[PDB]
Amino acid sequence: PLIVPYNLPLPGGVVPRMLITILGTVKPNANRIALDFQRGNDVAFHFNPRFNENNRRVIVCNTKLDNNWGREERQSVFPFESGKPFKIQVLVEPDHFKVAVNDAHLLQYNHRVKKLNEISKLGISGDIDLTSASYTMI
Numbered sequence: 001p002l003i004v005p006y007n008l009p010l011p012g013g014v015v016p017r018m019l020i021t022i023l024g025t026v027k028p029n030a031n032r033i034a035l036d037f038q039r040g041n042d043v044a045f046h047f048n049p050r051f052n053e054n055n056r057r058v059i060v061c062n063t064k065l066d067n068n069w070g071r072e073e074r075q076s077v078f079p080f081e082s083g084k085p086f087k088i089q090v091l092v093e094p095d096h097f098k099v100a101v102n103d104a105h106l107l108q109y110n111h112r113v114k115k116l117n118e119i120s121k122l123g124i125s126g127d128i129d130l131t132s133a134s135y136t137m138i
């Protein structure tokens with residue numbers, strides 16, 4: 001049981017083969033969740049499940065540079081369920097962030113922010129009970 005919004009420092013930023021694991025439970029009437037990998041004020045990778053966007057569930061991913069959102073990448077495969085425990089794993093690869101939810105591949109997001117060693121914070125927010133947030137090298 002951790003407080004949301006939650007800040008996970010990523011010391012010296014990220015590097016390929018770094019695996020970030022977030023464990024929590026989706027709240028029973030959830031509307032949205034958001035992971036924000038940040039380079040100072042810029043959002044290198046915003047991962048945002050939306051539970052009711054025009055009565056559809058969709059994963060929206062994007063980057064924010066100089067406070068402007070870029071072109072979104074959308075994924076209709078939606079592995080979250082309100083009220084259930086989840087595990088989100090973000091594997092940093094040389095050209096992409098690879099995301100798997102509950103041990104099933106979900107999507108990949110090409111690096112738009114290229115100074116990986118400056119993406120030094122992961123913000124976790126939205127309609128979840130957060131259990132744990134940590135990282136390791138695979």
Ligand SMILES: Cc1nnc([C@@H]2O[C@H](CO)[C@H](O)[C@H](n3cc(-c4cc(F)c(Cl)c(F)c4)nn3)[C@H]2O)n1-c1cc(Cl)ccc1C(F)(F)F
Binds near residue numbers: 061125126
């Ligand atoms: C219109 C519209 N419809 N969605 C968005 C933005 O789309 C972005 C992806 O492109 C992010 O999801 C933004 N966002 C969502 C959240 C968040 C999520 C959570 F889950 C929580 Cl808990 C939380 F606190 C915060 N913070 N910023 C979201 O506001 N916009 C939007 C809104 C503005 Cl002010 C400016 C530009 C846009 C644009 F379309 F260009 F992207």
Ligand SMILES: [Cl-]
Binds near residue numbers: 048
């Ligand atoms: Cl949103």
